[PDB]
Design a protein around this ligand. Structure first.
Ligand SMILES: [Ca+2]
Ligand SMILES: [Ca+2]
Length: 275
């Protein structure tokens, strides 16, 4: 029947579920490669596509977006997996093509969309090594608007003492998420630097795949959603908190693990974070 992936347990999401907080009424935008609307373990509330050659956002041609969405909110039923915030309202915002890539403008368009539609949380399990002025402006706009923005830190490992976090995670207004294994040890591909903020499970993350399938992937793209999902549970318990409050609470309630250059503030603990 249904399994609870370990990563979900590892951030203490189940504890909130038993208090009765499952992400209800919270709008999460997954800014990725779309969400397969034919997967029974997902409930999509809305969406829009910014890729010109692939106008249906409910059609994930890459499978990256569907896996990410499953971590956030795979439904609580008799099958497949379970997500961090299983009652969250999930929006498919397509900005990456079949090949996994996307144009900055598509990405910006997708942020603008999320803003305009009053998304509560945005997940960006994507990144590049270069930022742009307009990317930064849109991300700043989201946070200025009241949205919690989460982004993968990247899968660039270490490079001596240089920062390896990619854009948009490198920006201050964004929560950059690195990955740990089940042992709380950083995964070797996990990006590092001053901008890394928090850690979440990123190794063998079992989630939803297109075509009514399930599978495991590793990477900071798999870690990010854990945090976006955590932000969702907090907002279900404290609808009146601002993103300011949510971000603060997640960063001040972590489990510390090692030099912040490598672990940022540590592993999130949404049970603690949620108050
Ligand atoms: Ca399920
Ligand atoms: Ca950051």
């Amino acid at each position: 029947a249904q399994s609870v992936p370990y990563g979900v347990s590892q951030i203490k999401a189940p504890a909130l579920h038993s208090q009765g907080y499952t992400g209800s009424n919270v709008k999460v935008a997954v800014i990725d490669s779309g969400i397969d609307s034919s997967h029974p373990d997902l409930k999509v509330a809305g969406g829009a596509s910014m890729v010109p050659s692939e106008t249906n956002p409910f059609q994930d041609n890459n499978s990256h977006g569907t896996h990410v969405a499953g971590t956030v909110a795979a439904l609580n039923n008799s099958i497949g997996v379970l997500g961090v915030a299983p009652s969250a309202s999930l929006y498919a915002v397509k900005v990456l093509g079949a090949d996994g890539s996307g144009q900055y403008s598509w990405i910006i368009n997708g942020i603008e969309w999320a803003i305009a539609n009053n998304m509560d949380v945005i997940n960006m399990s994507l990144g590049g090594p270069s930022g742009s002025a307009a990317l930064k402006a849109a991300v700043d706009k989201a946070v200025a608007s009241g949205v919690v923005v989460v982004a993968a830190a990247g899968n660039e490992g270490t490079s001596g003492s240089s920062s390896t976090v990619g854009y948009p995670g490198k920006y201050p207004s964004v929560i950059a998420v690195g990955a740990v294994d089940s042992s709380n040890q950083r995964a070797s591909f996990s990006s590092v630097g001053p901008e890394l903020d928090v850690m979440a499970p990123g190794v063998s993350i079992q989630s939803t795949l297109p075509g009514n399938k399930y599978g495991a992937y590793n990477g900071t793209s798999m870690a990010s959603p854990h945090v976006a999902g955590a932000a969702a549970l907090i907002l279900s318990k404290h609808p009146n908190w601002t993103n300011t409050q949510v971000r603060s609470s997640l960063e001040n309630t972590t489990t510390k693990l090692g030099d912040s250059f490598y672990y940022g503030k540590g592993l999130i603990n949404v049970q603690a974070a949620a108050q």
